[PDB]
Design a protein around this motif. Structure first.
Motif, PDB file in Angstrom:
ATOM      1  N   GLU A  12       0.759  -1.247   0.000  1.00 49.83           N
ATOM      2  CA  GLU A  12       0.000   0.000   0.000  1.00 49.83           C
ATOM      3  C   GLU A  12       0.795   1.307   0.000  1.00 49.83           C
ATOM      4  OE1 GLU A  12      -2.793  -1.013   3.287  1.00 49.83           O
ATOM      5  OE2 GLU A  12      -4.356  -0.557   1.805  1.00 49.83           O
ATOM      6  N   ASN A  13       1.604   1.538   1.026  1.00 50.13           N
ATOM      7  CA  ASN A  13       2.360   2.788   1.089  1.00 50.13           C
ATOM      8  C   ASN A  13       3.838   2.657   0.735  1.00 50.13           C
ATOM      9  OD1 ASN A  13       0.028   4.318   2.213  1.00 50.13           O
ATOM     10  ND2 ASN A  13       0.379   2.980   3.988  1.00 50.13           N
ATOM     11  N   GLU A  14       4.127   2.123  -0.448  1.00 50.25           N
ATOM     12  CA  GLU A  14       5.512   1.946  -0.875  1.00 50.25           C
ATOM     13  C   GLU A  14       6.246   3.232  -1.246  1.00 50.25           C
ATOM     14  OE1 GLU A  14       4.601   2.511  -4.461  1.00 50.25           O
ATOM     15  OE2 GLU A  14       2.826   2.595  -3.175  1.00 50.25           O
ATOM     16  N   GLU A  15       5.535   4.354  -1.314  1.00 49.35           N
ATOM     17  CA  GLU A  15       6.190   5.613  -1.655  1.00 49.35           C
ATOM     18  C   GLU A  15       6.757   6.282  -0.410  1.00 49.35           C
ATOM     19  OE1 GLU A  15       2.939   5.290  -0.735  1.00 49.35           O
ATOM     20  OE2 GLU A  15       1.940   6.912  -1.828  1.00 49.35           O
ATOM     21  N   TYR A  16       6.424   5.746   0.759  1.00 48.95           N
ATOM     22  CA  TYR A  16       6.918   6.297   2.017  1.00 48.95           C
ATOM     23  C   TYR A  16       8.217   5.606   2.423  1.00 48.95           C
ATOM     24  CZ  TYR A  16       2.402   8.636   2.711  1.00 48.95           C
ATOM     25  OH  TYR A  16       1.301   9.450   2.575  1.00 48.95           O
ATOM     26  N   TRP A  17       9.066   6.320   3.158  1.00 50.71           N
ATOM     27  CA  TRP A  17      10.331   5.742   3.591  1.00 50.71           C
ATOM     28  C   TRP A  17      10.092   4.620   4.585  1.00 50.71           C
ATOM     29  CZ3 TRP A  17      14.935   5.210   1.819  1.00 50.71           C
ATOM     30  CH2 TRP A  17      15.976   4.775   2.659  1.00 50.71           C
ATOM     31  N   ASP A  18       9.148   4.832   5.497  1.00 55.91           N
ATOM     32  CA  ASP A  18       8.799   3.829   6.494  1.00 55.91           C
ATOM     33  C   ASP A  18       7.876   2.828   5.795  1.00 55.91           C
ATOM     34  OD1 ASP A  18       8.184   2.505   8.976  1.00 55.91           O
ATOM     35  OD2 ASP A  18       6.359   3.719   9.095  1.00 55.91           O
ATOM     36  N   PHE A  19       8.444   1.688   5.413  1.00 63.47           N
ATOM     37  CA  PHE A  19       7.734   0.638   4.688  1.00 63.47           C
ATOM     38  C   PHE A  19       8.042  -0.727   5.312  1.00 63.47           C
ATOM     39  CE2 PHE A  19       7.642  -2.377   1.012  1.00 63.47           C
ATOM     40  CZ  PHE A  19       6.299  -2.227   0.663  1.00 63.47           C
ATOM     41  N   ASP A  20       7.019  -1.539   5.563  1.00 65.00           N
ATOM     42  CA  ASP A  20       7.272  -2.841   6.173  1.00 65.00           C
ATOM     43  C   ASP A  20       7.687  -3.864   5.117  1.00 65.00           C
ATOM     44  OD1 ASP A  20       7.479  -5.062   7.786  1.00 65.00           O
ATOM     45  OD2 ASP A  20       5.691  -4.593   8.967  1.00 65.00           O
ATOM     46  N   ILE A  21       8.969  -3.826   4.773  1.00 63.17           N
ATOM     47  CA  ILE A  21       9.549  -4.716   3.773  1.00 63.17           C
ATOM     48  C   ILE A  21       9.494  -6.186   4.206  1.00 63.17           C
ATOM     49  CG2 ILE A  21      11.830  -4.442   4.782  1.00 63.17           C
ATOM     50  CD1 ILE A  21      10.924  -4.948   1.026  1.00 63.17           C
ATOM     51  N   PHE A  22       9.527  -6.430   5.511  1.00 61.95           N
ATOM     52  CA  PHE A  22       9.501  -7.798   5.991  1.00 61.95           C
ATOM     53  C   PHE A  22       8.102  -8.409   5.925  1.00 61.95           C
ATOM     54  CE2 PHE A  22      13.259  -5.792   8.001  1.00 61.95           C
ATOM     55  CZ  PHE A  22      14.211  -6.514   7.275  1.00 61.95           C
ATOM     56  N   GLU A  23       7.071  -7.580   6.053  1.00 60.76           N
ATOM     57  CA  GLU A  23       5.704  -8.084   5.935  1.00 60.76           C
ATOM     58  C   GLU A  23       5.497  -8.414   4.453  1.00 60.76           C
ATOM     59  OE1 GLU A  23       3.035  -9.177   7.273  1.00 60.76           O
ATOM     60  OE2 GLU A  23       1.676  -8.984   5.562  1.00 60.76           O
ATOM     61  N   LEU A  24       6.163  -7.665   3.582  1.00 63.02           N
ATOM     62  CA  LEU A  24       6.053  -7.934   2.152  1.00 63.02           C
ATOM     63  C   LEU A  24       6.693  -9.294   1.905  1.00 63.02           C
ATOM     64  CD1 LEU A  24       5.325  -7.174  -0.682  1.00 63.02           C
ATOM     65  CD2 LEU A  24       7.496  -5.950  -0.911  1.00 63.02           C
ATOM     66  N   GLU A  25       7.847  -9.509   2.532  1.00 61.71           N
ATOM     67  CA  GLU A  25       8.589 -10.761   2.416  1.00 61.71           C
ATOM     68  C   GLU A  25       7.727 -11.943   2.866  1.00 61.71           C
ATOM     69  OE1 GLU A  25      11.752 -11.734   5.374  1.00 61.71           O
ATOM     70  OE2 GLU A  25      13.075 -11.832   3.619  1.00 61.71           O
ATOM     71  N   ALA A  26       7.118 -11.803   4.038  1.00 61.63           N
ATOM     72  CA  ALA A  26       6.267 -12.854   4.592  1.00 61.63           C
ATOM     73  C   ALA A  26       5.024 -13.064   3.737  1.00 61.63           C
ATOM     74  CB  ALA A  26       5.865 -12.501   6.021  1.00 61.63           C
ATOM     75  N   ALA A  27       4.312 -11.980   3.444  1.00 60.36           N
ATOM     76  CA  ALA A  27       3.097 -12.070   2.643  1.00 60.36           C
ATOM     77  C   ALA A  27       3.336 -12.741   1.295  1.00 60.36           C
ATOM     78  CB  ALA A  27       2.501 -10.681   2.433  1.00 60.36           C
TER      79      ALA A  27
END
Ligand code: MG
Ligand code: ZN
Length: 338
Positions: A12-27
């Protein structure tokens, strides 16, 4: 398009610096690169630039991600998805948007994606001391970086349905290929200070000298003209990919800590193997039996991170990154607890 909800949410908010890259990894079940790559490339309208189908892009991202080793604690496709994310964030900055050309943006997003493909979780020094096949193939010179670039082009143009460059004009392609290669090679750390110092000497210093004359419309053009030369765009691109590549310390504390754990384990494994095979230990300090990850991170930050981001920040204005870097540095300092 129809991306499973959980994955759509994680992006959802990939344009922001604070991004949960690990939830992307898990998902995504360890396939963050094809999903983030698709959304990013679309947002930047890359196939509409290279004249490729979303189908050709999907196949390309799939073969690239497939060649990142999931078994590596750090250098797996999640690291590249992360570097891709930081790269887009930088390309999205006014200073960068008003300095680089669309083709540079294309080169940067592609370079990030492939910059570590087929990385073996061992440093160049290890491959060389071991007389590894790749070291012999590249004459102990920029071994991994040369391999990342080369393999990426081999996989891309070796199969029609993967070749995202298929519908390009030889000239434009040649220019894009050279630009991608340059950025990938610029990630070799032995040349760290060389690249940083050139950026400071050819970009920050001259620019600071001009920003004294005032905000003259005639002064702006002088600046715009100076920063847009092919030489300076190349130095800016080199700085951009280098900063994206080692941007972990500038991330939200939770992520910063996870990245430190991952790269540490990768380094520890190498050290264990070197002493085993009897090979010379290139990273004597990075031994799981004696190394303090917090102190090591502090040294890393003080030695490379601080000055490089100082310069990048000065040029692009990245308060969020600098604030996280300070908070993280303080966190590592606060762990001594002795
Ligand atoms: Mg690398
Ligand atoms: Zn990397």
């Amino acid at each position: 398009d129809d991306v499973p909800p959980r994955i759509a949410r994680a992006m959802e908010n990939e344009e922001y610096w604070d991004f949960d890259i690990f939830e992307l990894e898990a998902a995504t079940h360890n396939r963050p690169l094809i999903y983030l790559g698709l959304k990013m490339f679309a947002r930047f309208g890359i196939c509409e630039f290279l004249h490729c189908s979303e189908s050709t892009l999907r196949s390309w991202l799939q073969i690239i991600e497939a060649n990142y080793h999931s078994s590596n604690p750090y250098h797996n496709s999640t690291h590249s998805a992360d570097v891709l994310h930081a790269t887009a964030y930088f390309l999205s900055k006014e200073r960068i948007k008003e300095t680089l050309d669309p083709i540079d943006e294309v080169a940067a997003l592609i370079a990030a994606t492939i910059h570590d493909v087929d990385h073996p979780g061992r440093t160049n020094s290890f491959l060389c001391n071991a007389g590894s096949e790749l070291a012999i193939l590249y004459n102990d010179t920029a071994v991994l970086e040369s391999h990342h670039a080369a393999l990426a082009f081999q996989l891309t143009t070796g199969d029609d349905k993967c070749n995202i460059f298929k519908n390009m004009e030889r000239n434009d392609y040649r220019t894009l290929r050279q630009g991608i290669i340059d950025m990938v090679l610029a990630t070799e750390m032995t040349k760290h200070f060389e690249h940083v110092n050139k950026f400071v000497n050819s970009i920050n210093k001259p620019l600071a000298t001009l920003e004294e004359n005032g905000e003259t419309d005639k002064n702006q053009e002088v600046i715009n003209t100076m920063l847009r030369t092919p030489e300076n765009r190349t130095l800016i691109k080199r700085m951009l990919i280098k900063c994206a590549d080692v941007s972990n310390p500038c991330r939200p504390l939770q992520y910063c800590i996870e990245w430190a754990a991952r790269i540490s384990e990768e380094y520890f494994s190498q050290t264990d193997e070197e002493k085993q095979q009897g090979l010379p230990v290139v990273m004597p300090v990075f031994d799981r039996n004696t190394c303090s990850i917090p102190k090591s991170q502090i040294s890393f930050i003080d030695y490379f991170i601080t000055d490089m981001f100082d310069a990048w920040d000065a040029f692009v204005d990245l308060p969020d990154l600098m604030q996280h870097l300070d908070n993280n540095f303080k966190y590592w300092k606060g762990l001594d607890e002795m």
